[PDB]
Tab-separated table of C-alpha atoms in Angstrom:
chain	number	residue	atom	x	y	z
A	67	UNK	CA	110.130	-35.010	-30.919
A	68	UNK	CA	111.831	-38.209	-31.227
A	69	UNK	CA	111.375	-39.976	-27.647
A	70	UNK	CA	108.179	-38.704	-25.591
A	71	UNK	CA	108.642	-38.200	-21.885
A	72	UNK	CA	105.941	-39.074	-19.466
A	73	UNK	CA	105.203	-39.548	-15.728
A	74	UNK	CA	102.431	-41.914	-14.659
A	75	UNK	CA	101.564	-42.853	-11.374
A	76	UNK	CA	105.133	-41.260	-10.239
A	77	UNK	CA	107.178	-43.829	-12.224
A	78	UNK	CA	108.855	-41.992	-15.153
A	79	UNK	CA	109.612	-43.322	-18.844
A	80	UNK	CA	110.766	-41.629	-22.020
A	81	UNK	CA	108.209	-43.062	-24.974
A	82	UNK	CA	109.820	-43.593	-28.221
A	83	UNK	CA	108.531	-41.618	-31.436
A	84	UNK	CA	107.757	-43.957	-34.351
A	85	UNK	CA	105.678	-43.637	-37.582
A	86	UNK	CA	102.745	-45.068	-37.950
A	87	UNK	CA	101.023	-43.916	-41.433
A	88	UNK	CA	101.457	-42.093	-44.845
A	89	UNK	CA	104.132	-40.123	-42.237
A	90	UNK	CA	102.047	-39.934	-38.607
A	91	UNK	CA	104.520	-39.529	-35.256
A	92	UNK	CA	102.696	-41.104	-32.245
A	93	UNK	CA	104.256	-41.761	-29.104
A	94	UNK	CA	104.493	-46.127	-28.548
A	95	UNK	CA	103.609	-47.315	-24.780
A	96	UNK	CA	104.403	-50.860	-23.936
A	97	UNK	CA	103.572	-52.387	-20.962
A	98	UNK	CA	104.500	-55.966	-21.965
A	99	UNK	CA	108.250	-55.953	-19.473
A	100	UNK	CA	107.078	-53.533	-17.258
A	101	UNK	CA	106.014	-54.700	-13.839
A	102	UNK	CA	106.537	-51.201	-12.642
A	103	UNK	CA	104.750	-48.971	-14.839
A	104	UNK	CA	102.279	-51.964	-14.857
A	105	UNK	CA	101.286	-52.229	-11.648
A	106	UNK	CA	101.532	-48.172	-10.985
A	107	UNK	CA	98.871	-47.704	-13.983
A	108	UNK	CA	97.075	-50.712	-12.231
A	109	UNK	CA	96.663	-49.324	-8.779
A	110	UNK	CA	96.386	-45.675	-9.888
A	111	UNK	CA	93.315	-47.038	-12.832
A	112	UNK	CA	91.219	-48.815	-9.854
A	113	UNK	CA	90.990	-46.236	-7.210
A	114	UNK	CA	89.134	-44.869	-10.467
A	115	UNK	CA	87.317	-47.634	-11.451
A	116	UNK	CA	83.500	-47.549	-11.431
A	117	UNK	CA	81.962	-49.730	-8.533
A	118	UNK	CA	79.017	-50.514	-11.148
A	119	UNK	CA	81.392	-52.690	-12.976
A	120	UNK	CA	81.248	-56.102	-12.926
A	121	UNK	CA	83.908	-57.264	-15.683
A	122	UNK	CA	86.787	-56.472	-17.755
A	123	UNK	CA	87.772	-56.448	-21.604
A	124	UNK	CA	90.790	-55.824	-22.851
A	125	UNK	CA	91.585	-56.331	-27.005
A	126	UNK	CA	95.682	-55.989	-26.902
A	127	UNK	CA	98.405	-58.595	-25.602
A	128	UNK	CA	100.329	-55.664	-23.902
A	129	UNK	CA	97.732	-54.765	-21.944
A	130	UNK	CA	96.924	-58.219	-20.373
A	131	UNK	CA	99.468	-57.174	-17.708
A	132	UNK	CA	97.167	-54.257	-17.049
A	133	UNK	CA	93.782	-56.492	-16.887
A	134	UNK	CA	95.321	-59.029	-14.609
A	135	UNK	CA	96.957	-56.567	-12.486
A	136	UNK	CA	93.306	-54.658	-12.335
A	137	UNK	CA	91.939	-57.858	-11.919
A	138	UNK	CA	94.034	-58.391	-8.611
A	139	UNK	CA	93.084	-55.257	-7.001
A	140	UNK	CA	89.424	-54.664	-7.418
A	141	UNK	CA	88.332	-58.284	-7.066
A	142	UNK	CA	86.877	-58.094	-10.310
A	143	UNK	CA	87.307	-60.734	-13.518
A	144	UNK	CA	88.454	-59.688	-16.975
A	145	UNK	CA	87.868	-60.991	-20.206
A	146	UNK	CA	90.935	-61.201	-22.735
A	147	UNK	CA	89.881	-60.761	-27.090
A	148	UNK	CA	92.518	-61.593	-29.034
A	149	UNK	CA	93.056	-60.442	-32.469
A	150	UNK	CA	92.313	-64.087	-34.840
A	151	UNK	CA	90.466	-67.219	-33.413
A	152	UNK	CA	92.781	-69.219	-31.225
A	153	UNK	CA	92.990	-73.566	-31.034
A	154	UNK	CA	91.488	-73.289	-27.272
A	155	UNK	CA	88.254	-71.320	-28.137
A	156	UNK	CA	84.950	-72.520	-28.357
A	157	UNK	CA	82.418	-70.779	-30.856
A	158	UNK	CA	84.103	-67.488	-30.770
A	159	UNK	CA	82.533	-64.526	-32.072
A	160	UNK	CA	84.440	-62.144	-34.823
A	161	UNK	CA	83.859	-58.763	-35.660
A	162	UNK	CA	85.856	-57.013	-38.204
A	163	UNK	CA	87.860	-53.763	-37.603
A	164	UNK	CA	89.719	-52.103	-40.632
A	165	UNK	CA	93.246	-50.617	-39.474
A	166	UNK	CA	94.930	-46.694	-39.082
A	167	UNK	CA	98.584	-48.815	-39.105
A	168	UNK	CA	98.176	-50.446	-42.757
A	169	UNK	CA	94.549	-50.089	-43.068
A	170	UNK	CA	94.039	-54.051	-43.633
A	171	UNK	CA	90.946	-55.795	-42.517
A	172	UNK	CA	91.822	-56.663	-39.068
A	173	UNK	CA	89.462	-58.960	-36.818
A	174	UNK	CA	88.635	-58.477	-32.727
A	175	UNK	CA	87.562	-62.115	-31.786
A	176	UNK	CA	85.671	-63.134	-28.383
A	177	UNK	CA	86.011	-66.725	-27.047
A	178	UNK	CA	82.432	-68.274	-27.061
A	179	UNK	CA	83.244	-69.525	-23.326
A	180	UNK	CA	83.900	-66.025	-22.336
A	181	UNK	CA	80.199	-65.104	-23.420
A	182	UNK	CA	78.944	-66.492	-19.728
A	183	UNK	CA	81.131	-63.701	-18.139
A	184	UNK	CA	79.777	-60.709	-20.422
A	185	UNK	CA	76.289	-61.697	-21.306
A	186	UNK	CA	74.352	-59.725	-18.723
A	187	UNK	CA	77.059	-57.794	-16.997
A	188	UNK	CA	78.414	-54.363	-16.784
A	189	UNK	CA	81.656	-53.814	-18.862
A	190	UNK	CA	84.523	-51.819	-18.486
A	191	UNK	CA	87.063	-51.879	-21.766
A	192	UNK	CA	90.583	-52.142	-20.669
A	193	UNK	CA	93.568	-50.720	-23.031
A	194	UNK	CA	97.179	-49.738	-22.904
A	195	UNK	CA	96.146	-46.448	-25.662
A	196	UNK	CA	93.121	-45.569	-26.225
A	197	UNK	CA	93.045	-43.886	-29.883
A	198	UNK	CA	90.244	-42.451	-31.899
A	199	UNK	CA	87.765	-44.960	-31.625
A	200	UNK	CA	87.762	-47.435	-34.926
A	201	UNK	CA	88.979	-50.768	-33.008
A	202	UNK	CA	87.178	-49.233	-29.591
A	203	UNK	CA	83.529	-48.873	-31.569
A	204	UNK	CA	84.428	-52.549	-32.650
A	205	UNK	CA	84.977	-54.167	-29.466
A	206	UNK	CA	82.034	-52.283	-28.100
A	207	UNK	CA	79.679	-54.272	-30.821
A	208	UNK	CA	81.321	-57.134	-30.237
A	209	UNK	CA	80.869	-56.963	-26.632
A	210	UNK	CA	77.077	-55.620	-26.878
A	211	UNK	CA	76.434	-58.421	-29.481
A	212	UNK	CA	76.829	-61.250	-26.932
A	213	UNK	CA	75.262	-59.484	-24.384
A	214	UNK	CA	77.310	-56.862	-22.211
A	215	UNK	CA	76.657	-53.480	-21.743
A	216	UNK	CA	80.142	-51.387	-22.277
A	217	UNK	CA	80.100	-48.596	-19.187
A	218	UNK	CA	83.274	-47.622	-19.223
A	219	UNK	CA	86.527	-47.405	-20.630
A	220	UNK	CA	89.743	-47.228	-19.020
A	221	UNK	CA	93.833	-46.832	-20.350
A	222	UNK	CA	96.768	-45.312	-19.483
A	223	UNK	CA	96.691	-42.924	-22.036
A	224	UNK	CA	94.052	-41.116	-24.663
A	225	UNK	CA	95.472	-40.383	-28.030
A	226	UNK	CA	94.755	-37.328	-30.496
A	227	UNK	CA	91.323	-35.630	-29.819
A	228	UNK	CA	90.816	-35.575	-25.994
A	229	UNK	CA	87.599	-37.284	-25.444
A	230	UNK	CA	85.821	-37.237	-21.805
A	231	UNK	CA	84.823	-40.661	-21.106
A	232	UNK	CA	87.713	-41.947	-20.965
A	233	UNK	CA	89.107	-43.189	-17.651
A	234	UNK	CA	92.938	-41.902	-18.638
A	235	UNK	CA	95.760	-41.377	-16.395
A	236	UNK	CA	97.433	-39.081	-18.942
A	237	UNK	CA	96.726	-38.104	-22.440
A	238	UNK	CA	99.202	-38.318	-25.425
A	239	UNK	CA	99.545	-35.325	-27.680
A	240	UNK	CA	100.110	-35.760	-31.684
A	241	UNK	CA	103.794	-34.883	-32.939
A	242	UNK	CA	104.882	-33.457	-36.229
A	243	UNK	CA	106.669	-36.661	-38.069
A	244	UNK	CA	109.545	-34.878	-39.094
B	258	UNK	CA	84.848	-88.144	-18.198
B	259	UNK	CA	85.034	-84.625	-19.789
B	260	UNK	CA	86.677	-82.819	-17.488
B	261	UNK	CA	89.867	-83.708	-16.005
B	262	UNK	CA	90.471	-82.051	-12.110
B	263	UNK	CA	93.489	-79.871	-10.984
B	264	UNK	CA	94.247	-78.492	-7.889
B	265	UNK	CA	97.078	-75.865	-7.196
B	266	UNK	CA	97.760	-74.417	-3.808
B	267	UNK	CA	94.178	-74.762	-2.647
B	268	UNK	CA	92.627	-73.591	-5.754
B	269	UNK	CA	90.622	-76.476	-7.506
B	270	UNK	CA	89.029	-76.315	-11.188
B	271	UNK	CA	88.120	-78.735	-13.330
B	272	UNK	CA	89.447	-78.622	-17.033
B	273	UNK	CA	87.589	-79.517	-20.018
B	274	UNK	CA	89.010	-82.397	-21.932
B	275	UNK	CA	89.616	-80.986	-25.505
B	276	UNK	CA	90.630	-82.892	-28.366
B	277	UNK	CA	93.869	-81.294	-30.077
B	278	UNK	CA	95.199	-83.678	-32.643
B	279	UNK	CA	94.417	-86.546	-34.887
B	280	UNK	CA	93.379	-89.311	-32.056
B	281	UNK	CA	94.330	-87.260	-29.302
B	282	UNK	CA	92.719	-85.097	-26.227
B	283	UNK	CA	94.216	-82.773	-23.557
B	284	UNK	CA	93.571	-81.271	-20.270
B	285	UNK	CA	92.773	-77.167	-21.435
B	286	UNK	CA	94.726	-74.898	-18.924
B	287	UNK	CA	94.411	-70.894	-19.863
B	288	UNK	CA	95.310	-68.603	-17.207
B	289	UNK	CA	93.954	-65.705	-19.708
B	290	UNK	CA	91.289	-64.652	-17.165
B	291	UNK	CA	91.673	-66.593	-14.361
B	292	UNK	CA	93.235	-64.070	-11.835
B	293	UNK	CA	92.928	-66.585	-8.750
B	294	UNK	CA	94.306	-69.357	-10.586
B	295	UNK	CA	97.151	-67.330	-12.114
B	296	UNK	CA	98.187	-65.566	-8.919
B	297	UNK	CA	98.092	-69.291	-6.750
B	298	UNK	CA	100.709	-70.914	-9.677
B	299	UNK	CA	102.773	-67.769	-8.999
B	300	UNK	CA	102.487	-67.706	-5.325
B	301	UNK	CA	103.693	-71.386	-5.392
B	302	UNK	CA	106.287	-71.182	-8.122
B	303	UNK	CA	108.439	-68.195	-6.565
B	304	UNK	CA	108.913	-70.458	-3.368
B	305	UNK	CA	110.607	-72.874	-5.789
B	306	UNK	CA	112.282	-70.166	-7.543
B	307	UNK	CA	115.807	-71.478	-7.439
B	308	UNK	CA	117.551	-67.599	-5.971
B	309	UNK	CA	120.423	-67.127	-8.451
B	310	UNK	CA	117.286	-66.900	-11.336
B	311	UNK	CA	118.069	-63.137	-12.561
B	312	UNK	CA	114.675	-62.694	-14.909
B	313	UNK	CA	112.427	-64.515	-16.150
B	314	UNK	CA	110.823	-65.287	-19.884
B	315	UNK	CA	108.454	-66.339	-21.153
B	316	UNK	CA	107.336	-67.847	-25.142
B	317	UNK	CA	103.674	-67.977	-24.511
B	318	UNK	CA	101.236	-65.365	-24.243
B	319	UNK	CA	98.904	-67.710	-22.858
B	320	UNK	CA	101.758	-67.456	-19.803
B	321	UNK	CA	102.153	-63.602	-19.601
B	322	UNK	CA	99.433	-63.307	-16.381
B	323	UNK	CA	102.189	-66.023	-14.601
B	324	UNK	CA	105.251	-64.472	-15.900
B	325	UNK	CA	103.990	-60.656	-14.521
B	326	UNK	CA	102.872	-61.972	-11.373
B	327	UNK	CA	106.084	-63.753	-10.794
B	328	UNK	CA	107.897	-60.772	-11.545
B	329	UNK	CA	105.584	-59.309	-9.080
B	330	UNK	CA	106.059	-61.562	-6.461
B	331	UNK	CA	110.031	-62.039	-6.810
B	332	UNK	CA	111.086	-58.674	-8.089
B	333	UNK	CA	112.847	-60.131	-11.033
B	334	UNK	CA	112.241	-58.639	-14.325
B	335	UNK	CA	110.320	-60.275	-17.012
B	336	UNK	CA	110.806	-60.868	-21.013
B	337	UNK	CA	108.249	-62.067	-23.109
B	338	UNK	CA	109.286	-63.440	-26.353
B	339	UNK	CA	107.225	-63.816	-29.409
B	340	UNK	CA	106.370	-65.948	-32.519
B	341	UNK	CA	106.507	-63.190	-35.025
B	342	UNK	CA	108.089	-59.871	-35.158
B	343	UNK	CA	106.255	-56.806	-33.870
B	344	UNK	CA	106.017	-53.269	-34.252
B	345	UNK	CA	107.618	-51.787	-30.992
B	346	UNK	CA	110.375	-54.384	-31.249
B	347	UNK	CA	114.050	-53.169	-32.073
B	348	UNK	CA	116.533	-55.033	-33.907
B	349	UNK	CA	114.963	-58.481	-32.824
B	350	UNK	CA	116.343	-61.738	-32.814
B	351	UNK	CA	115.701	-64.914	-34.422
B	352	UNK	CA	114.880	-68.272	-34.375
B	353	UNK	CA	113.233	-70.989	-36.483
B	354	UNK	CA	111.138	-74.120	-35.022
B	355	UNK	CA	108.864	-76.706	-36.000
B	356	UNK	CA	105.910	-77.134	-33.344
B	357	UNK	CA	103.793	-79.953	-32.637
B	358	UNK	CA	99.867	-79.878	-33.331
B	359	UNK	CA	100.626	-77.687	-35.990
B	360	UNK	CA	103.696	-79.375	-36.931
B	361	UNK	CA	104.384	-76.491	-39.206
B	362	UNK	CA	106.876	-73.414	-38.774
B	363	UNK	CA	106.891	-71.476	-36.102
B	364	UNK	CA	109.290	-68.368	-35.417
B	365	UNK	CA	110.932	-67.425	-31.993
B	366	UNK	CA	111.914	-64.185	-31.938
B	367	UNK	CA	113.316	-61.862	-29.102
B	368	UNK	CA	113.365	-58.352	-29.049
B	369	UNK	CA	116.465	-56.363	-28.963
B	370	UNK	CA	115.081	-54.392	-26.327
B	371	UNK	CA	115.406	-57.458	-24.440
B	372	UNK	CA	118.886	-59.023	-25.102
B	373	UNK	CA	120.056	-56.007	-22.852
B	374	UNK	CA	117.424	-57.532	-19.837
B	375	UNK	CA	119.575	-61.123	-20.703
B	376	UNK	CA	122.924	-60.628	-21.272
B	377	UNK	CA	125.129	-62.267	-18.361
B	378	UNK	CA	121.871	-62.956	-16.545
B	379	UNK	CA	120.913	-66.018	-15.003
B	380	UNK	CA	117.119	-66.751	-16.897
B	381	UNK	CA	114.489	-68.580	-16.261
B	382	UNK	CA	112.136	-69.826	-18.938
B	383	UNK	CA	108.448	-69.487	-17.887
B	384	UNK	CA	105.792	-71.807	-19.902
B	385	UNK	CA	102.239	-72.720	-18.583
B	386	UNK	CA	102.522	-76.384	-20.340
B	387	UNK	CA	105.558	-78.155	-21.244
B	388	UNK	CA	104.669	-80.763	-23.252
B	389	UNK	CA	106.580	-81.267	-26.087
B	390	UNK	CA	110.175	-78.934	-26.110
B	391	UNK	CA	109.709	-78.108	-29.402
B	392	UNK	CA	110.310	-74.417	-28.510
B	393	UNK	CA	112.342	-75.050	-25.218
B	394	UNK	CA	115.504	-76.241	-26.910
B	395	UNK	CA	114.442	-73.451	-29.123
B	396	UNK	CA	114.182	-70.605	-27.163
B	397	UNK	CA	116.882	-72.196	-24.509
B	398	UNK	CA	119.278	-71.585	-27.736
B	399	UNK	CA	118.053	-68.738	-28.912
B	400	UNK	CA	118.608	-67.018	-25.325
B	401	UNK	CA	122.018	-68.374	-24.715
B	402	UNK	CA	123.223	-66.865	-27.740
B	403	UNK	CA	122.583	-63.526	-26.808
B	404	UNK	CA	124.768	-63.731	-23.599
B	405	UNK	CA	121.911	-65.651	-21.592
B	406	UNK	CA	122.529	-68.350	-19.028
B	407	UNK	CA	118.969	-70.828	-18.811
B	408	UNK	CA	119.277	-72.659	-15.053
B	409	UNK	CA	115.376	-73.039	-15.252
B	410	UNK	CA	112.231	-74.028	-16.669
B	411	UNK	CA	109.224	-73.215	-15.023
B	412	UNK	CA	105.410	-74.006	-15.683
B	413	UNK	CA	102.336	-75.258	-14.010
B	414	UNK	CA	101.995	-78.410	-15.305
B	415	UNK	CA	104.376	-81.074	-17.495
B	416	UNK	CA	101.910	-83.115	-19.807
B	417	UNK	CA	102.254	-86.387	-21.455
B	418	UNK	CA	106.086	-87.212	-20.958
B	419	UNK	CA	107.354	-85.866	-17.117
B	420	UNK	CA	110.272	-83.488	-18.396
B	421	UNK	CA	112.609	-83.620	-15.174
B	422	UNK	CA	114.378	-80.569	-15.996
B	423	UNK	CA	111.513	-79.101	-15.187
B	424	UNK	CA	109.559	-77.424	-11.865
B	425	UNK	CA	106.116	-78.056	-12.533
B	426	UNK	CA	103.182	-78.099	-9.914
B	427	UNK	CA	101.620	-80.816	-11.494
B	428	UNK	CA	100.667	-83.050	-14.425
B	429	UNK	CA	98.688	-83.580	-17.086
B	430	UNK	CA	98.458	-87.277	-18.670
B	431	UNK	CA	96.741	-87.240	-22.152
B	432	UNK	CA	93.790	-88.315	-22.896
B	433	UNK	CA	91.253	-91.120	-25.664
B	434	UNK	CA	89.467	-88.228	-27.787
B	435	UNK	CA	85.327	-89.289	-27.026
């Protein structure tokens, strides 16, 4: 295809085509803009959100919108990585992830005054796209390194291989490039 | 005194006092993570929302929990601008800027995506900190070039120098670097 249509939550969007590899078509979700879709993924994610939980981790600016918004409604805090150390963090903690886009050494980075809200606690990942699990076993060490325990992990969509513990509202299939 | 105290809308925290330049220390605001804190600056900010504001954006990602719940709140769309190009962006826009701290060169850059959301709007820039301007003459150009008419800066607090064009909820002196 060239645009991928999708209905989440009953709010509708067409999801543009785009390559991605040596010639890989995947369908590109951004929430960053969309109050709507944003806060429909939001509501519909924490009606299915594990009471166990006691914090959230999300690794991607676009979902932030997502985390704060799931924040909101279940009561519960999240926890933003970001993807190189930042001037406002403290003694952060890196772990390295090696990319599908351009396969260059990429880096998931925790603040070291987030480790407080993981170190002990329950975790639930947060993402916009959940892929095959190369940046998602990353941010799992990196949150299990300081101290969390990952128990779930949510998105709005699972990509490729349909795994089962994923808390999805949809799943993405894999196009032919053209 | 290490910590310098805030209080918006009832909310109170108390924010470390971080060094950030040569002889220099200021109050650290992130509303990364801070879902009560994030939603209160909203809450407060829409009721001083001047009504012919059309959308809203924002040049910080630090900012992007205040600029969604705004949207949220006032049902005016939101644009998030960014300091390097990326991926999902189409035909973006453009501009160059030296910063402060850094003091080096920083890009602006809009997508084209967004100039639609813009165009013959009335805008409001969203920042958590104005300090400087270094990017709100910046991105107040690169907007208005696109079509875009800026009646409005918003934030949560003005530091150092109290910016006038600007509706703040409070502000931030600097600080002797201990």
């Amino acid at each position: 295809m060239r645009t991928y249509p999708v209905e989440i939550a009953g709010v509708r969007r067409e999801l543009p085509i785009v390559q991605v590899g040596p010639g890989v078509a995947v369908a590109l979700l951004n929430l960053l803009g969309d109050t709507e879709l944003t806060e429909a993924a939001a509501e519909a994610l924490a009606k299915r959100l594990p009471p166990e939980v006691e914090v959230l981790v999300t690794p991607e600016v676009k979902a932030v919108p997502l985390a704060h918004a799931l924040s909101r409604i279940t009561g519960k805090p999240y926890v933003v990585a970001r993807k190189t150390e930042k001037p406002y963090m403290i003694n952060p903690v890196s772990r390295q992830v090696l990319s599908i886009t351009t396969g260059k050494p990429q880096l998931l980075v925790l603040d070291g005054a987030d480790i407080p809200r993981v170190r002990g606690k329950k975790v639930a990942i947060v993402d916009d796209v959940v892929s095959t699990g190369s940046t998602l076993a990353g941010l799992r060490e990196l949150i299990e390194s300081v101290g969390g325990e990952v128990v779930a992990v949510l998105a709005v969509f699972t990509e490729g291989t349909p795994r089962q513990d994923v808390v999805a509202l949809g799943h993405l299939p894999l196009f032919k490039p053209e």
